[PDB]
Automatic annotation (TrEMBL), chain B:
Component of the 40S ribosomal subunit. The ribosome is a large ribonucleoprotein complex responsible for the synthesis of proteins in the cell. The keyword Ribonucleoprotein applies. Its main location: cytoplasm. The keyword Plastid does not apply. This is Small ribosomal subunit protein eS10. The chain holds residues 1 to 98 of 165 of the full protein. Keywords: Cytoplasm, Isopeptide bond, Metal-binding, Methylation, Nucleus, Phosphoprotein, Ribonucleoprotein, Ribosomal protein, Ubl conjugation, Zinc. Zn(2+) binds at W64. GO terms for cellular component: cytosolic small ribosomal subunit; nucleolus. It comes from Oryctolagus cuniculus (Rabbit). It is found in: Cytoplasm; Nucleus, Nucleolus. Residues 3-97 form the Plectin/eS10 N-terminal domain. GO terms for molecular function: RNA binding; structural constituent of ribosome. Component of the small ribosomal subunit. The methylated form interacts with NPM1.
Amino acid sequence: QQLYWSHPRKFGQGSRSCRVCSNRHGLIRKYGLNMCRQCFRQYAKDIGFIKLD
Amino acid sequence: MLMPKKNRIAIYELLFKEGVMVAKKDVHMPKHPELADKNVPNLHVMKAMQSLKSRGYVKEQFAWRHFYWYLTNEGIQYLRDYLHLPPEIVPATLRRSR
Amino acid sequence: HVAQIYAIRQSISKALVAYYQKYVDEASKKEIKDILIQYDRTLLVADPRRCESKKFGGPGARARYQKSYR
Amino acid sequence: MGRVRTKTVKKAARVIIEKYYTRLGNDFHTNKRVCEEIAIIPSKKLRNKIAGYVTHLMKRIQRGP
Amino acid sequence: VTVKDVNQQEFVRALAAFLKKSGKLKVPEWVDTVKLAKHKELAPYDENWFYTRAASTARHLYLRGGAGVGSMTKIYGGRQRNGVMPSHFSRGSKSVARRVLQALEGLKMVEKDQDGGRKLTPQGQRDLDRIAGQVAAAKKK
Amino acid sequence: MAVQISKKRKFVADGIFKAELNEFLTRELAEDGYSGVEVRVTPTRTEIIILATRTQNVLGEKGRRIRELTAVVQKRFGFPEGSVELYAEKVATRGLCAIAQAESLRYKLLGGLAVRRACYGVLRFIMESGAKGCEVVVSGKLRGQRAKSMKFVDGLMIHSGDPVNYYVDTA
Amino acid sequence: AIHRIRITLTSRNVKSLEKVCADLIRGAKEKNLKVKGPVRMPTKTLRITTRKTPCGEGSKTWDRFQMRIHKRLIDLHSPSEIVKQITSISIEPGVEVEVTIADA
RNA sequence: AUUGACAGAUUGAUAGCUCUUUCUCGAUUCCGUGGGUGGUGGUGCAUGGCCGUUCUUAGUUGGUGGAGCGAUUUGUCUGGUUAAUUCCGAUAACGAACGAGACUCUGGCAUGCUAACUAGUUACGCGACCCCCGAGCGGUCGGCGUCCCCCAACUUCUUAGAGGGACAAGUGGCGUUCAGCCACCCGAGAUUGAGCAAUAACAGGUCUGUGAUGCCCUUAGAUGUCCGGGGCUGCACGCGCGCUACACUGACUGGCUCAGCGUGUGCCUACCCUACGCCGGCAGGCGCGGGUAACCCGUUGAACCCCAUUCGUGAUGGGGAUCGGGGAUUGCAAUUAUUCCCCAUGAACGAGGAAUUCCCAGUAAGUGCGGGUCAUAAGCUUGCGUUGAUUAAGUCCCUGCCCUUUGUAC
Ligand SMILES: [Zn+2]
């Protein structure tokens, strides 16, 4: 019963995940974005990040 | 009419008080943000609402791993029958506009 | 280090030229300025040159990383 | 070995002179600033360029049509 | 003629010597055995190195005050051959910079300033400035 | 309570919120005439302005859906009670929004007006509505089961340059 | 009250920010007192560089995303009511105005 | 009805998983069927979206006219010109559209303006302290550390706004004395470098980024999920990006001495950056402080470089692979060595066949330092500066591309 989710999920790309896609590879951790780099590009402009050069 | 009563029936009351309800699509949340009277986790919430929808007593919108549950008129009626509540009641939709 | 020198090198010889202009006389300034330039233009005028930015796909700016092919 | 003006220069400059030969002049910086007054240009460089070709055309005009 | 006015290389030499002639610094018991950082393949060749480091330490403190051990490491820093992987900075030895600072404390060359670290001390300021005068009166060269 | 997170962090986070919202509103109110959201925080209030064509639809029965959404925004994004409100504004000239028409075209495709005649229609509409010019591209499997694309187009366009960052609206 | 209030404007956009500060300085002059010009901080870039792709396989290219973040700020020697009248004006954009009471 | 259970056997397991026995929510259940739902299952040759590539070049399009039975063509061109289908001009074309350019960010000029205790201060005043701090008999100087507030004085340096600023504008050549090209003056000399970027494609990649998704498969003895354990690190072998080298223009050992871009806790699920003081050779340990930051880290006291050391052409102190012994931290756990330090060990390699890569100005190359991932963390990458060249300024030999005419049995 209790061992269902009993493995320490404190750290590492197991634990942390995206705030959209929820996949766990290419998390833009910086500035606490925490989205899939794909997701990042998808929302960039709305988030405010903007390609100047 | 399912599983632990106290938990379920506390959900159903929360679904009446606010018209709406949200979760976070996340099984392993031994609390639930809001509610949080006693354990009553995310899920139990999540799987009750999913029944509600299935028998046609609440609508949906997903958006960014979360869940949102706008509640139907047919849904409201079902809860007031289930919670054996009065015909006046006021769920949430009342609010003075101007 | 080397830059810093090249800056002060500029600095004082500019500053002198500035001093002469403002307090001495503009005939003297010109006399000096000539004697600095005929040696080197850098003693007064700056190098607009500055470190050119790297673009991805190479270690630096103009250089690219090695292409493999086969 | 580089700078040719585009038609967006050469039209504007041609037209400007057709309409403001009078106010325009050989002295560049005067007619650099004329072109700001009489014409609504969006950018600085284009303004500055137009005025150039204007001063190139003022030079030709002073020497037959 | 203050110390800034002098060729700092040939200064620390006479400073160390000064510190040797006085003969009351406090060189620890390791000295011989210890490396001097994780940088270094080896220990120093100059066996009386401690006298030299103290000097450099005091002469830094004359220049930039309020400089703790951490400060001293970063100053006494440099390259770290990692062999077959590429090179990096390594911070110098904490303890040797701590012991030097505690040795100059015991001399009363230095003192722990408010806002942390060490500043070299008046009686100290004397000595460094004194030997600057010495070097400047070595010869016209 | 008295956190005060970093300016580098704060501005990022807020954009994220505004973005995550738009999505939710796009999923919810697309069929219901949606065209955008405009948030503006104030002293002790966070007035958030929806954009739409069918305003009466999003407001609902005697006012109801706006009350539902506000509650959900309150619930979801961690907003205290009465520190938020969803104002629905009628969009000026719906034609000259891209996402509005992109929705319209999407609706029409789902209803079963043919790919060509609906599209053509949408383009003619935004043209009449006074657009500089336009590009409508529909991709995927138009008749059969091999991929293809249409590209119904008219009038003055751009692609390159900075201008496009502001001169075209794309959806 | 007179105690040295400090206003702190910050924005992702500049022109909007520079309009705002100008509107508060004008307001400070109208109700004449004191100000010390809008003190530019060095504006920070938030820089992300991601691969253009999803997946790994084209030629390798990079999006070079930015999000510059500007900070102005203004001193002031005045009571609270005058400040609240000023700051209630100049709101609508995405400027983050922060008013600190005195000293720090 | 038939959800959930200490034993004790079993089990890997303190899995009520199973067998023996308990007792339990009390309306959950179990069985069918319909039917779901999920899936980092299959399909990118079923699709969307997004990339990449064609294709970094100058290219691309319809309207209306003219030409052809037509497919088509003309416009979109002999010539000169340009980085440019960029212009001048010619003209069954006329007038338009996209690209290109303009544009955006950037870099370099502003003793001019607006500006500041989260910049400097800035030179002053030196109001000083301060001790002989020094020179000096003593005054007057030199040097900073700083101690300074505000009722000093600003904005050279600093930050960053708004303006300005160069346009081939000026002079001389060459050019239908057009478009332009060359040179030189003044001063940046049209040329700082990126970003964006057409039409039509490709059955390029992606269904393992997505609660984008068709079909198909599975769906309780699971291809759902979770827990343990292993594996993706396995080594006759072959290849691709890489680092470190082969030393003396070097190595060590001391000493002196200068950066710039950033980043940082109090978080979306548990933690940052770290000064100072003690403990330890060291890796690190333990105490107190500052920092949501031009406020603290942090005058970021970086490396190479410079200056003295020794060594002495010896696989030598070049090199630091391999392996033994111990010690530190990260962690729930590090054995198949997580990283880190110490001693010891001391391999190939003495510049590399045929082949081929990348590159022309603050560039290559050297050199370090940031960001990314990140409990632990770079031989990678994405940025930063520091040191700083040789050689060209041209041509189509090769490799390719763009236009013209030509031939084509493709
Ligand atoms: Zn996503």
